């Protein structure tokens, strides 16, 4: 087409979605990761994770307001990945990289799994 | 912080949100612009438009599944702006620029109003 494009639009949208999450505006699901609860927008989770895409496109699961993750999932790893979904920034540290990579494999976040594998390879 | 950032994340999220819109997945509102209906995600509309942000943060309006816009709003102008919200690309043409600018002023999309004003100034 003959369109013009606003370079910062996608980043500005994501920043506003994170501001809505902060202010608990229109959050429509609670993700339970053992003893912790995380509120989020189903659409953002589906846009970032192959696991959430499969969950919320299922005719029965799309209607649930609470999703319980596998008990082996680490809440801190999930929290770091949820922040990445809403900001593009990944708080990857020597002390959390194994939990983050395991959580990203479970959530099917291929780009995160890729950077974790590379950082682990560099340490060996 | 000591975060790393995935450059293409925000653009990839927006592309996936547009794929959900295409496939009518988790759309939760219908915007009526005279005889036309447009399905969308309330969160994306709020992230892009000062008008939708004010509408869906209102305690009564946040619960509506149908929003009727002012009858003076042109459906084609709205359609072009809705596509911009989900893609960052604005289909601005000599034949639609006045309707697009008027719709962007009503929707409170300051960056779009700015580019329309500049393109109009260049023609004069």
């Amino acid at each position: 087409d003959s369109c013009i494009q606003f370079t910062r639009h996608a980043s500005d949208v994501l920043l506003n979605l994170n501001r809505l999450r902060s202010r608990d505006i229109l959050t429509d699901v609670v993700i339970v990761v053992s003893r912790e609860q995380f509120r989020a927008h189903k659409t953002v989770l589906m846009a970032c994770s192959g696991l959430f895409y499969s969950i919320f496109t299922d005719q029965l699961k799309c209607n649930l307001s609470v999703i319980n993750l596998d008990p082996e999932i680490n809440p801190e790893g999930f929290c770091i990945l949820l922040d990445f979904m809403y900001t593009s920034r990944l708080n990857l540290r020597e002390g959390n990289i194994m939990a983050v990579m395991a959580t990203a494999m479970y959530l099917q976040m291929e780009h995160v799994v890729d950077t974790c594998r590379k950082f682990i390879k560099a340490s060996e | 912080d000591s975060c790393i950032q995935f450059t293409r994340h925000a653009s990839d999220v927006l592309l996936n949100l547009n794929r959900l819109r295409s496939r009518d997945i988790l759309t939760d509102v219908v915007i009526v612009v005279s005889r036309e209906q447009f399905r969308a995600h309330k969160t994306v509309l709020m992230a892009c438009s000062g008008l939708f942000y004010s509408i869906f943060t209102d305690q009564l309006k946040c619960n509506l599944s149908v929003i009727n816009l002012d009858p003076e709003i042109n459906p084609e102008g709205f359609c072009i702006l809705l596509d911009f919200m989900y893609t960052s690309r604005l289909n601005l043409r000599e034949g639609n620029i006045m309707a697009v600018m008027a719709t962007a002023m009503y929707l409170q999309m300051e960056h779009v109003v700015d580019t329309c004003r500049k393109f109009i100034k260049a023609s004069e």
Partner: peptide
């Protein structure tokens, strides 16, 4: 704004 740019030409994409």
């Amino acid at each position: 704004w740019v030409i994409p």
